[PDB]
Amino acid sequence: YGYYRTVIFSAMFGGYSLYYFNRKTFSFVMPSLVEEIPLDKDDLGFITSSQSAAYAISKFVSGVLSDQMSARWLFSSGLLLVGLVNIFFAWSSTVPVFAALWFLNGLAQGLGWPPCGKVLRKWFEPSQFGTWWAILSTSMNLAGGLGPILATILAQSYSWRSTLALSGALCVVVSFLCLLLIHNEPADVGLRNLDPMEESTLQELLLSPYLWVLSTGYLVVFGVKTCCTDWGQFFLIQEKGQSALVGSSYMSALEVGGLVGSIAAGYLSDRAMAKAGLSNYGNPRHGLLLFMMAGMTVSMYLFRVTVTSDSPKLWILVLGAVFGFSSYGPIALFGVIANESAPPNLCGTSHAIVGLMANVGGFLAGLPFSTIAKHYSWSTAFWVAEVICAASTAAFFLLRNIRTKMGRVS
Ligand SMILES: O=P(O)(O)OC[C@H]1O[C@@H](O)[C@H](O)[C@@H](O)[C@@H]1O
């Protein structure tokens, strides 16, 4: 019975890794193109913006669609389309064709997660859902970590035209293999399907306060994380008077702390869920959620106040790691909670809505924050961000007891 789980999880891991690698291959192979074709910065910004917009639309559309359609076919079709786009990218010469192909790639990138989430929910009991979710989500981290080395090594021996086509062909072959391997439901194999604890309707799903509470929480958390990640180096350089290498080390520490935080949050949340009992109200992951948001606020306060022009690098690295931990925990916890608590027949819609709120929150922490910083100072902007985070965490603590199982009310 575990052999099927092992095979399915390995197939999903490989598929998602190839997804992310061929999403980032363009930035990986930037040089050979820039010294092959005289491209300007505006054109590259245009291409990246087109891909980002296509992916942002395709995430919501793919979630809503995968709420209904099968998982194996959708996953394989997405991977095949991405591979074909990467193949066609190797013969392109003019910028408009580059932009059109990359927009198509961004559209096809949306069919990556929702099938994996649906299969993971259908095949795994709730006591391991969060742990295996985090383990699967580390695949994109691995691909990003091991991309540039391979890209540079291959470019040192061959041009990009021989680099993108090979990856596209690999995508096609792996897509066919994953179509062969992945099984959507245990009953298809011929086993005993899991029994969950009157189909729900979107009308009676949208009228649940817990969904809006979760959406607001994710908006706030994602906005704060994006703001800190964007402007930490500038805050450390312009006023604190440090060096650039300190900023680079602080970024690396934040990334490592974030990875560790995501994995630890998943593991501890799964352990607490398994140990605790069953009830309609509340959710066992709320304790870890609130603890990590408290870590958010405390780390922000200490970084804003204590760090001065005469502080050792060790303090800065420790603060960065702690903030990364406490900021990459709740981001995964919101996704796990949003997928799990939803009724089985509407698992993707909640995740899609939460992601759209995440997009709005990520927008909110862009130009307005820079405007505020350039108006008064950087410290004032970080102070208002900290106040927002503290108010949000207090409000979320007050509403820990509201009904969680959204959908049909009996
Ligand atoms: O593409 P999506 O829908 O945003 O999924 C990716 C991320 O979505 C978040 O909701 C999850 O918490 C993360 O674990 C996951 O990595």
Swiss-Prot record:
Keywords: Antiport, Congenital disorder of glycosylation, Disease variant, Endoplasmic reticulum, Glycogen storage disease, Membrane, Sugar transport, Transmembrane, Transmembrane helix, Transport. GO terms for molecular function: glucose 6-phosphate:phosphate antiporter activity; glucose-6-phosphate transmembrane transporter activity. The keyword Oxidoreductase does not apply. It is a multi-pass membrane protein. The chain crosses the membrane at residues 79-99, 100-120, 134-154, 162-182, 204-224, 245-265, 287-307, 314-334, 353-373, 379-399. GO terms for biological process: gluconeogenesis; glucose homeostasis; glucose metabolic process; glucose-6-phosphate transport; phosphate ion transmembrane transport. It is found in: Endoplasmic reticulum membrane. The keyword Chloroplast does not apply. Changing residue 144 to E: In GSD1B; inactive glucose-6-phosphate transport. InterPro entries: MFS (IPR011701), MFS_dom (IPR020846), MFS_trans_sf (IPR036259), OPA_Antiporter (IPR051337), Sugar-P_transporter_CS (IPR021159), Sugar_P_transporter (IPR000849). Its main location: endoplasmic reticulum. One of its GO terms (cellular component) is endoplasmic reticulum membrane. It comes from the Eukaryota. It catalyses: D-glucose 6-phosphate(in) + phosphate(out) = D-glucose 6-phosphate(out) + phosphate(in). Mostly expressed in liver and kidney. Inhibited by vanadate and chlorogenic acid. Gene3D superfamilies: MFS general substrate transporter like domains (1.20.1250.20). PANTHER family: GLUCOSE-6-PHOSPHATE EXCHANGER SLC37A4. Belongs to the major facilitator superfamily. Organophosphate:Pi antiporter (OPA) (TC 2.A.1.4) family. It is linked to Glycogen storage disease 1B: A metabolic disorder characterized by impairment of terminal steps of glycogenolysis and gluconeogenesis. Patients manifest a wide range of clinical symptoms and biochemical abnormalities, including hypoglycemia, severe hepatomegaly due to excessive accumulation of glycogen, kidney enlargement, growth retardation, lactic acidemia, hyperlipidemia, and hyperuricemia. Glycogen storage disease type 1B patients also present a tendency towards infections associated with neutropenia, relapsing aphthous gingivostomatitis, and inflammatory bowel disease. Inorganic phosphate and glucose-6-phosphate antiporter of the endoplasmic reticulum. Transports cytoplasmic glucose-6-phosphate into the lumen of the endoplasmic reticulum and translocates inorganic phosphate into the opposite direction. Forms with glucose-6-phosphatase the complex responsible for glucose production through glycogenolysis and gluconeogenesis. Hence, it plays a central role in homeostatic regulation of blood glucose levels. This is Glucose-6-phosphate exchanger SLC37A4. It comes from Homo sapiens.
